[PDB]
Each structure stands twice: as structure tokens, then as C-alpha cells.
Amino acid sequence: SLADYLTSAKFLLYLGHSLSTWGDRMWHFAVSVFLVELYGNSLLLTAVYGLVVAGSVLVLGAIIGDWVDKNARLKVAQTSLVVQNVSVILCGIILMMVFLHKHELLTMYHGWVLTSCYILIITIANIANLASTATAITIQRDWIVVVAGEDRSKLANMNATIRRIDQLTNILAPMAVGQIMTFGSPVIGCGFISGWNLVSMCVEYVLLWKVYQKTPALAVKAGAEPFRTFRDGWVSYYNQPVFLAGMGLAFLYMTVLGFDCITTGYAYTQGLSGSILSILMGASAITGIMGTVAFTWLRRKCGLVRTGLISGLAQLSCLILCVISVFMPGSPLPIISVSLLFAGVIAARIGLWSFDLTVTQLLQENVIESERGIINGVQNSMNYLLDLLHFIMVILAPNPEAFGLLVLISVSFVAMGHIMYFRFAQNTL
């Protein structure tokens, strides 16, 4: 009877999200390889890359959300998909070209050639990231709410499945692309990424059209200029009832306590090897999946607004271990310090992902449909704004005493975000 389930719009949404997330992770891995290789030992350009991406989203999120609000759903979805995939394909061709001629670019040309290659790569990657943000808004904040009926358990299960998909992709995609870059060449990996995006674009295009055909309600939308739209969107975001919950979710991005950040190099400094690091990342993904399961259970039990409180309490309770580990023997501010630090990180993943699922469902339940895009656009502009701040703090303080300082700062930001959520929750109830 799976032949019936495999043709439902819900599974088609899951499949398209899986393809998009896989391609996006392989693309981010290729860009990281390009930055580490052709621009190592440079600090100005890493900061420029992060600043360009985060500041473009910070300036254009309300504009992209208004564009999603003002147009037909199938049009904006297929347009965002085509723009993102064509950008990644062209940038991957350019990347394999610069990887083929790496030592010539480093040794026997004027430096403006390599500078122009960097400028072109950063620009095309910025365009692809803006298209990915438009896709995330239109699909995970609009289409999924429509494919779910009025039912809230269905929306919750769909959000949890989407989170499990990206939790698995976050560990699996980098492994595959790195094995392709060792068993072959980085040129081979860039060509594979370009071909993967070229095929996945067509498959996801047909998948979006099929979901649009199976969901008639998607065809029924409810209804200098750019500066006025920007100001109106930010003022509309400030006056939302769920504004404090979104502010706390954005404050959660100002953190160092994860395996995507500089904790990996700190673990190398503390004597752990790469196999232990892979085991810890796998345990972290396991705890994130456990957090999705805990979100569905607690939402069935205590409701959504209390699920957010319980998730924030769990996350702070697990970060207490990191706070203690910074003040323990073997801290460079013995195995006892890193043990408590990584134990707190892996344990806090549960409450982190439960709280993220909670704020996501609050945003998609309590925002007016005609405002669904622009509000979420400003929400993206908030998240990146606190991500970019972390991206600065890590760059200016890259030595081990600063690691403990940054850990204390990240725990304080997590506490500030949960305090804002507690204010919203005490207001709501």
C-alpha cells in the first residue's frame, strides 16, 4: 500500500526538500574547500564572504518576502529553484576551472586575476543563497501550511520530518563529497556537484508541479518603493504577537556550542582525534532527532507554548555542564573538561531543536496568510544578523582562552533568548 503513500503530496514535498538540502550541503562544502585552499592564511576575505552573505540577507529579506507575498505560488517556487540551481551550476563550473589552474593562479599571474575570481565566486554564491532563502520562505512557511489542512498534528509531524531530513543531511552530505574529493579530485567534486544540480533541478521542478496539481488550495492566494516595503515589513514584524518568540529564536544563533563551529579545532587542540570527533557529531545528530521526537510528544501533551518553555529549560540545563567545564582542571582558560563540554553540547541539542520546532509552528500558526512572506523574510533577516555577529566574534578571537570566553558569551545569549520567550509565554497565558 506504499504505492498510494508515495504519490501523496506530503511525500513529494519530503523528497523535494531532501534533494534541495543535499545539493545545498554539497555546495557549501565546495565553497569551503575553495576558501580554505585558494585563500588560506587570509583573514580579510573570510570576513568579507560572511559579511556579504549575511548583509545581503539582512537588507533583502523583507524585499524577498514581499515578492513571495505578491505573486503566484508556483511561479515563485519554480523561479527560486531555477535561479538557485543555475547559480550553483555556473559557480561550480567556474570552481572546477580555478581548481584546475590553482598553482598558475597562485604563482604566474597578476593578483587581480585571482581577486576577480574571488569576486565572481562570492557574487554568484550570494545570489544562490538569496534564492535559497526565497525557497525556504515559500516552501517551509507557506506551502507546507497549505498542504496541511486545519490539522495541527499533521503540520507538526511534517515539520519534524523536515528537521530529521536536514539533521541526517548535515552529517551525510559532507562525508560523501569529501570522499569524492579524495578518491578523485576537487575538480571531480565540482563537476559532480554541477551535474547533481543540473539533474535535481529538473526532478524538483516536476515535483513542485505535481504538488501544485495535487493541492488545489495552493492556487487560491488570499489576495522609493523598496525602502517603504522594508520599513513597513520591519514595523509589521515588531507588532506581531509572536515577536518575542522570534527574537529569542534569532538570539539562539549567536552561539559557538556546535560541531559546525570552532569547537572542532578546540577538540583537536585538547588531544582528541578525528574518529572521536566523528563519533561526537553522530551523537549530536542522534540527539537532534531525539529533540524532534520530544517536540511532537510535548506538543501533543502540554501544548505548543509550554513545549517552548520546557525545551528552553532543557537546553539551559544541558549548557550548565559547559559553563562548569570552563572552570575545571585541564581548561586552557586532563579529560574532565572536554568531557563535560561535549556532554553539554550533545545533550543541549535536544532542547535546541525542540524549541526551534516550537517557534516555527508558532510562526506558521499565528501569522496572517497575506503577511506570511514578508514577516518570515524579516525573521530571516534577524537570524542572519545574530549569525553574522557570531561570525565576527569567532574571527577576532581564535585562541583557546578566548574559547572559554566565547562559551560563556554563547550561554549568556541562549539565556537571553529564553528570557524573551518566557516573557512572550507569560503574556500569552
Binding site: 580554505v36 579545532g265 582525534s273
Partner: peptide, 25 residues
């Protein structure tokens, strides 16, 4: 997760004589 990770598998990139995952930011 960070929206713009700079993580790669490599050797000697993050730490001497040890291969593995390495994030710069």
C-alpha cells in the same frame, strides 16, 4: 546551524599531523 559554514575534511588544516573535520568559523 550557521547559515554559512566553512567546514571541510582535511589534514594539517586545523591541527598538526591529524586529519578530519575542520571548521574555521
Amino acid at each position: 546551524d550557521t547559515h554559512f559554514p566553512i567546514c571541510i575534511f582535511c589534514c594539517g588544516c586545523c591541527h598538526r599531523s591529524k586529519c578530519g573535520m575542520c571548521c574555521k568559523t
